Write a protein that binds this ligand. Sequence first.
Ligand code: R33
Ligand code: R33
Ligand code: R33
Ligand code: R33
Ligand code: R33
Ligand code: K
Ligand code: K
Ligand code: K
Ligand code: K
Ligand code: K
Ligand code: K
Ligand code: K
Ligand code: K
Ligand code: K
Ligand code: K
Lengths: 372, 368, 373, 373, 373
Amino acid sequence: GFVFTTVKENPITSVKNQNRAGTCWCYSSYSFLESELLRMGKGEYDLSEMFTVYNTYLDRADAAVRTHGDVSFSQGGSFYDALYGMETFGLVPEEEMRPGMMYADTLSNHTELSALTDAMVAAIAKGKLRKLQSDENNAMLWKKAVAAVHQIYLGVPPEKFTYKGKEYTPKSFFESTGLKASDYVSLTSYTHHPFYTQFPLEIQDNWRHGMSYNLPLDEFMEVFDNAINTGYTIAWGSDVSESGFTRDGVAVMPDDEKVQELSSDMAHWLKLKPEEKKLNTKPQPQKWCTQAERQLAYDNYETTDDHGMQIYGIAKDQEGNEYYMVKNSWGTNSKYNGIWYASKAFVRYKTMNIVVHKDALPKAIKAKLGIK
Amino acid sequence: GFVFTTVKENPITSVKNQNRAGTCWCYSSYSFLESELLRMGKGEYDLSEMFTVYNTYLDRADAAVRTHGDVSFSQGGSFYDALYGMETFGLVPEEEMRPGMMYADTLSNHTELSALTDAMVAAIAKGKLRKLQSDENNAMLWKKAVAAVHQIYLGVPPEKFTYKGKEYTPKSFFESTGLKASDYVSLTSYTHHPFYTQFPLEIQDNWRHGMSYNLPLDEFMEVFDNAINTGYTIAWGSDVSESGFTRDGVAVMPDDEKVQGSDMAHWLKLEEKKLNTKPQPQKWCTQAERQLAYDNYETTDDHGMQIYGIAKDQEGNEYYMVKNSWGTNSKYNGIWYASKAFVRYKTMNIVVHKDALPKAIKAKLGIK
Amino acid sequence: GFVFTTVKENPITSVKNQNRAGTCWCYSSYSFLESELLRMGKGEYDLSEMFTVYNTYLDRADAAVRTHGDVSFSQGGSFYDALYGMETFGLVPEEEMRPGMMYADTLSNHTELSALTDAMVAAIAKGKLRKLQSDENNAMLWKKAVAAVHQIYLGVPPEKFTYKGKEYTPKSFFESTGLKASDYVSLTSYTHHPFYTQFPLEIQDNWRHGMSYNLPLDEFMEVFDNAINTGYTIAWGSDVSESGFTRDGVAVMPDDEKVQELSGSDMAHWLKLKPEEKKLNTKPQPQKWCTQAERQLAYDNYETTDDHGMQIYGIAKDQEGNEYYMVKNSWGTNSKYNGIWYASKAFVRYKTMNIVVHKDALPKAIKAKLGIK
Amino acid sequence: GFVFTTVKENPITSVKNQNRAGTCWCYSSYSFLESELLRMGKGEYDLSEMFTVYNTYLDRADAAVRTHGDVSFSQGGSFYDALYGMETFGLVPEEEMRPGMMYADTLSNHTELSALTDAMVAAIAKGKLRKLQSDENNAMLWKKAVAAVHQIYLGVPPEKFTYKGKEYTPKSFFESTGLKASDYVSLTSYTHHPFYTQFPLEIQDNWRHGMSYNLPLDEFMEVFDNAINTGYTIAWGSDVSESGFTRDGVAVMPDDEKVQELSGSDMAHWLKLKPEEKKLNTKPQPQKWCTQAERQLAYDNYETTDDHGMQIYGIAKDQEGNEYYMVKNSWGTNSKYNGIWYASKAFVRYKTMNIVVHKDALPKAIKAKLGIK
Amino acid sequence: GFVFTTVKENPITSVKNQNRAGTCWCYSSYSFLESELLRMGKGEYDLSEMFTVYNTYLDRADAAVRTHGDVSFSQGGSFYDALYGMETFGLVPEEEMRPGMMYADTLSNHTELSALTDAMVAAIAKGKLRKLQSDENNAMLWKKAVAAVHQIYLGVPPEKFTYKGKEYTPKSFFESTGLKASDYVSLTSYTHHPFYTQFPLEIQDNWRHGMSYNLPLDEFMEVFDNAINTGYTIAWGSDVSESGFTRDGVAVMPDDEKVQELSGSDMAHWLKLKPEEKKLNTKPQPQKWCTQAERQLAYDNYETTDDHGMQIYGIAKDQEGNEYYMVKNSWGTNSKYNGIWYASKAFVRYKTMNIVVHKDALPKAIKAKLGIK
Ligand SMILES: *CC(=O)[C@H](CCCNC(=N)N)NC(=O)CN
Ligand SMILES: *CC(=O)[C@H](CCCNC(=N)N)NC(=O)CN
Ligand SMILES: *CC(=O)[C@H](CCCNC(=N)N)NC(=O)CN
Ligand SMILES: *CC(=O)[C@H](CCCNC(=N)N)NC(=O)CN
Ligand SMILES: *CC(=O)[C@H](CCCNC(=N)N)NC(=O)CN
Ligand SMILES: [K+]
Ligand SMILES: [K+]
Ligand SMILES: [K+]
Ligand SMILES: [K+]
Ligand SMILES: [K+]
Ligand SMILES: [K+]
Ligand SMILES: [K+]
Ligand SMILES: [K+]
Ligand SMILES: [K+]
Ligand SMILES: [K+]
């Protein structure tokens, strides 16, 4: 089995549960922003994902209609959706818009909401309508309909609310946190664009076309360690549709060839049970990908924008392999109570993009990117 | 051409315009009920079709979901939808829910509303959802969604309103009119059910399964003349997808063989035959010929109108005076002249007041 | 009828014919770039649209696959596709890749090419494949397949060629022209984004997400006249799906109410009248001058769409003094004005999606508000 | 368990692996033709299936387009595809076109190739195109596209190559083998056509409409034994979608009623016993010996379909004396008998679609009834 | 206009009317066979197309099911369907199974029949059924269903009937005519197969895969004249989806370029004329004479398809001396020439798919090249 030893970890809030909704982009973004508020001495917060999820879906519906269905309308999103959201829509506390409150639950189940809203947006964006209807103030009626249905399943967004004795608006509550979207940068590492430049990742949930700074793979991984070692956390967008990512709290990238030599020869090893191979159950030699191997997986669909999480610490196993400590959003009913251990080889290979505070960047990388 | 002379006509209200919506079932029903209020001495009314159209669509959406998509969800309806509606939802005046007020118009355009609501109802009724969501009061969330979207395109139904100095609710306003749904009967004429019995017509817009009394074709047509001659009007549901039904205010059933100076080989390769422009010999259908057209899709539940009078042409042919709901931009300002032969052949069903029925027919149907 | 008188127009090349392909974005871009070369004293050029169209489709196929089918794969494009293309792929003269040369024609017919490549891109982008195949050099095989099929219908791109005695590559030929993509800016006018900022237009053929500067409508229209009056031309991307845009060389925006008032007919007889008798698009009529909000509504409700790309190169007036922009289309010369269109300023104000001009065509005050040095 | 003893078997080449491609028709045909070359004293050969697979798919795409989609375009084929192929295209050694060489593999994976080419052929054969494009030499452009995509995934067919010191073309290399397609006949056994006549089997992969001689079922089975006993092998096209065809190297046709009686349990208790305790396909059991009508019903009601192509090369017996045919499969050697299957004579009698043998493998009397010299 | 003068014509029966059914293949085949019976001194016959149509559709449904939907199930057919039909099913006179008798008509309207049977065959051939049901005699139940529905719309086929005082069966009535399918050959002219060989045309309605002899185009046309001049008629399967094939009884192949050269207008004045003004199909014009390659291109690129079946029975000339073939159509007599068409020799040379003639209609030299006794 695995025996992990924490090397360094930074403060995080409690593990949340997105339940039956594709809102990991918002839950991980808020785990990140809440750790940012803790680091900035602002205290512990519990931000409402349903508020940002609600406003993001309305903008995504508008994008689908403007592009006549090219922008897909689904539940996913990005870290930039939350950074854009707090500046544009603001923030509200968790108590003002809880998950499941409209259908007598305490956890999200957006299957019916999507079934209706996907059908509505498609009837407009991909239909035969030549002129969409509007009221005397040139307000579109279909936007009212999509907003009305979203409010029925997610709740009504508060215009004013009281939090710890003071009255706020979503905008004024965001201002009280002191957060600035300009303090955060998105980073990635690919070769189909020149290094040290900005490009929008060609993924479906990046329909806002948010930019990311492009770094070489080795410098990309240094930002991870530099952020954790200097007290920062990382918003981690990664591929999790791999055999190494298990339900038992670990994400590893084992070298299948090296494990076969330490065992049975190559012929007998290839007919040993998965329980007998122990590829994802014990510390194994990791495969350290090159920049080209990382690019191939992104080109050939083996690395997709699957899941958003938060990296907040570094740990080691009994054999000395290094891991990143990951805060998931699937509740606490797992081996490590909602915490995952992702090996550095896995993160190097399957990371789509990350968001960190600017001051988490090493001085040399800041200069190469032109960030003051 | 045609030269029509009114033989008798009964009071009607102004010609309305359903415009770009399949809501003729409600517009013709209200033309009928407004003539009924005039006949009963209640004065002139302008009832809101959009109020009943709104509530009918919510019930039709529920019917589609309960039957998992068997009941089709579309814009059409029946005279019974209005009779059931006034008893269940009530009535409001036209001013309280006008057509097009939500998209800066004065006439209906429900194409976008249908595009949205058809997609929503289908996602529930014909989708893969195994458990529909509900709130703490067991109210369905999808019904809230479908109702909210209808209100955005049709308007909010009034809970209270003031009409001619008095405050009303939709229910109390209906009660002030004195209308009773039990005073009205639906009549049809087909042979796939026994005569003088009741059966629900097997048509898509009769999803409420309203009953109709079955009469022989000759006795069926006697109700038409007796109703007009005793001062009543008729809610007329008929097939209008015929070559004889023209946009120029006439509906005729000409005998193609009898009209044929051109030989048969020249006639079958000839608008030039002046078939719908002058008085022609009519095809007087038998009961079996009427039944075949209903069985083979040639007679379908197309359109709802109001018959309010009888007229003659220059040659003495009898016509029924029809009040359509397509506005007044036609040859007779929204009025149609339907020959008795056309009505005999293409009528789906009619609704009249009980007292418009002859006494002998009333007894055969068992109507007190 | 119409009688037009040129007020001022700037030099253009011959009218081209895109024929049966949705490549107006490239033909108008090159009509624009060729006028830029004439203005810069470089002479007359005939740049190959098929070269840029070929390389653009390979990038669009890649965009469709990376976004798993979100980016639609179709024939359209944008002015930025050509501006990006000349910097990335270069330029070749018309003779090196002519339209229709592969199927024994002289004009484009890309219907069969699209039928195949649309089916190919969809099989990859929207299929069930879990791992796309690659060779020993990590090159994707599907990109080789899509590139090979495009070459069979469009031709092989030249690596080297000789033009007027000198040997070139596509890159070195572009460098010999002196064109710079940084000299050109995209402009638009909408209110769903703040004025004097940059945003990518939310249209399907802008899959590269090229930015456009947002201007108020009146300052936006000032760029048109200042560009023409100072000797520049305009790459004009506009909606042409209007009743006022006719096949007879005019694009007008008539006020239906004012024309109805100045005729004996009333509202009832007019709404059931013969369009030949309304003379709405056949003689000078009072124009409908849209507000900023009316322009925004048409873009919001699908009445203003990214339909067609053309070139504005002059200003003209009719017999009544109404001003028009002179438009060079790419539908050949078999029209009333030999491939030239006259679009009234009211039509351009209402139906323009975006334009591309040289930076120096901007008035100095507008340059300052946009932060363009 | 099963214990097999060879009665007679004829020389075969090594077991191949078709991997993730529906190319069993070509791998079995080449196992058959290679045994023919050994029998004819020509030595051991390793013919390239990918060469014949490449050329066959181009002909199948042409057939699909000519019939506007009636001929399905899929990976399958028939023994006649290979016999026709060697006469028309020729033969090349394995080294000149290996499987997987284009996507850095050593075994075939044609899933992506099919995804593209199925989409391309359907866009032409089942689309709305009214006139397909052609070049100056009347060569169809879509055929160029389908060929180019196949070469990207399968490799370039060699025009010339050197094999064991001699230079060949695909045609001249085929001529050096001495093989003749006229030496081989297709045989089947059905009643919806008269016996001792020729008819093309009404199966999808027989889009070339190759003929088969129709024999009574008993005389059909006599050809099997006579071919093996006189030193010939058989190209065996058969249904393998049966419970009796197992992954453990056996293909049996057990009589469910007799096996139930042979166990102590009655009809009720037997029908609620687990399959491990049923032992239907794990030990020798009484076989179901079908009639001609029972064989016809299974072909008529979809229970016998053209699933798989293999090679029968020997006869074996089990511990109880039951006779089996020794089958060379093309799924590699990672099975109980290293890629070899044992198919009981009852299974072969029941589930055989058709066979191909050399003319001289036919008994003289059967050869006379068919009119074969 | 056209003024035609008959050069020679052979006896034919009355013009029939297929009405709303795709049964031209059977009506033209029986017009052909009836002229053969007149030529052989057997008298005039009126054979029932609905009898052969009924039995052909049952076989085509079986073909669709056996090929799991590859063979399309539609109303069309071929001349070989009737030649095969009379040998297999026999012949009955028109009176025993008339068109429309089942739905109170006198002419065919098979739209509803097709709607039902297309859905039935597709539910079997392209469905998910793994085992089709059969009765105690191994007869397929779906074949009973498809046959029952065909009888409801077409009528019950007679087992016995009385004709001119004698009682017949469908088989014995066919024998009384003396017709032999072996007396007739199918001919075509294409280059994707070797000349003077037999191949089945790759067309959807040739699902029986009937063979045709391949002739060079010039020798192919010699059979036309030799058959007519020696007293025979021709079963003519041709493409009729051309601008030259008009509803006014003519089928021409005018050279658009050559007519403009003899026209008074220039190239620019001609390409801007009204169709009625450019008199392409209304007056005798110079014809376009195709090469063998041009004929092949039209078959390859979908411009020549197996559209219509007719009968050629004579040769005629126009006022200017151009040669035409006299064609007996099956669209009734309500046309300019009462159901007769005049097809120029250039049209027949270009748009003919295949023909069927009696063996003795072939020239002696051509008969020898094909190896026909
Ligand atoms: C991690 C998560 O919950 C969402 C799931 C979205 C699923 N949507 C579709 N498959 N169409 N993932 C993301 O938001 C990734 N950015
Ligand atoms: C009254 C009216 O106009 C409708 C037309 C709409 C029909 N559309 C559909 N059924 N989908 N006709 C009726 O309501 C017939 N009673
Ligand atoms: C004007 C032109 O040729 C293209 C046509 C695009 C057609 N697109 C589709 N049929 N899906 N228009 C543009 O490129 C506009 N940017
Ligand atoms: C045995 C083999 O590899 C092929 C598989 C063809 C599968 N085809 C489709 N799923 N469409 N089988 C044959 O070639 C049978 N003759
Ligand atoms: C000439 C004729 O009647 C048929 C047309 C039927 C074809 N219809 C469809 N394929 N849907 N033509 C032929 O039979 C030519 N073989
Ligand atoms: K929270
Ligand atoms: K993955
Ligand atoms: K009203
Ligand atoms: K009708
Ligand atoms: K050019
Ligand atoms: K438009
Ligand atoms: K091999
Ligand atoms: K089977
Ligand atoms: K006949
Ligand atoms: K044609």
